[PDB]
Design a binder for this molecule. Structure first.
Ligand SMILES: NC(=[NH2+])NCCC[C@H](N)C(=O)O
Ligand code: NA
Length: 234
């Protein structure tokens, strides 16, 4: 029957769970770094803390955007001379969220590529002195969304609650609304399964929410080829 619906539900929960566990470990570093900088954030200690093998191999750039405009980042790169950390989208994201949150994908100014930033408000007893941040390329996340093994029948993407596709294997549909990519019979966020057409291919979409992301309701979208998926086992 439509036990394929049961398959898309389990794969959606497993993917959403694997993305949560993947982001939890990286959030652990930024919080551990923000709490250490809360105890000491002198340029001597901030330098030694920002350059360590665990942070360097995990994020493209690990940095502390201070409250007075001071910026320290590892590794260093070419940023505009008027670079103010407080005008950055990751600075206001951690401030408005009041906790460790994820930024929607934006253009990284140094390497010119889509990245998602983990950011925490660095405070010492409700007195914020800066915002700690770490950059994850959108390409890394896309690889983690599709780490599960499909039968070549579909893929998996990340979409927000409002319908804006965050990370996606197709670079075109990134940051575009769910209505833009699917103009007619736009899939609905949440349960259940929706039918749509993309590039002349009948597609079935399912959405499983990413549990555990404080401050965000992000859904793992699973878009599978309808005809290719109905090739079932015995
Ligand atoms: N010194 C650096 N290379 N910093 C790079 C990280 C900056 C951060 N991605 C931003 O958009 O503001
Ligand atoms: Na396909």
């Amino acid at each position: 029957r439509e036990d394929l619906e049961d398959y898309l539900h389990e794969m959606g929960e497993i993917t959403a769970s694997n993305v949560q566990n993947w982001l939890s470990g990286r959030i652990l570093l930024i919080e551990n770094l923000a709490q250490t900088l809360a105890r000491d954030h002198s340029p001597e200690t901030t330098q030694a803390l920002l350059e360590q093998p665990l942070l360097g191999s995990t994020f493209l750039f690990t940095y502390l955007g201070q409250t007075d405009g001071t910026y320290t980042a590892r590794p260093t790169s070419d940023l505009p001379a008027d670079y103010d950390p407080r005008r950055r989208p990751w600075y206001n994201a951690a401030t408005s969220a009041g906790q460790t949150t994820l930024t929607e994908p934006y253009m990284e100014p140094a390497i010119h590529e889509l990245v998602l930033t983990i950011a925490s408000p660095a405070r010492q007893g409700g007195q914020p002195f800066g915002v700690v941040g770490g950059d994850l390329s959108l390409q890394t996340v896309v690889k983690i969304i599709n780490s599960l093994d499909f039968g070549g029948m579909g893929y998996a993407f990340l979409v927000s609650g409002d319908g804006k596709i965050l990370v996606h294997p197709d670079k075109d549909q990134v940051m575009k609304s769910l209505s833009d990519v699917y103009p007619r019979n736009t899939p609905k966020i949440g349960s259940g399964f929706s039918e749509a057409e993309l590039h002349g291919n009948t597609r079935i979409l399912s959405f499983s929410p990413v549990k555990g992301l404080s401050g965000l309701d992000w859904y793992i979208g699973i878009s599978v080829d309808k005809d290719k998926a109905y090739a079932m086992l015995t």
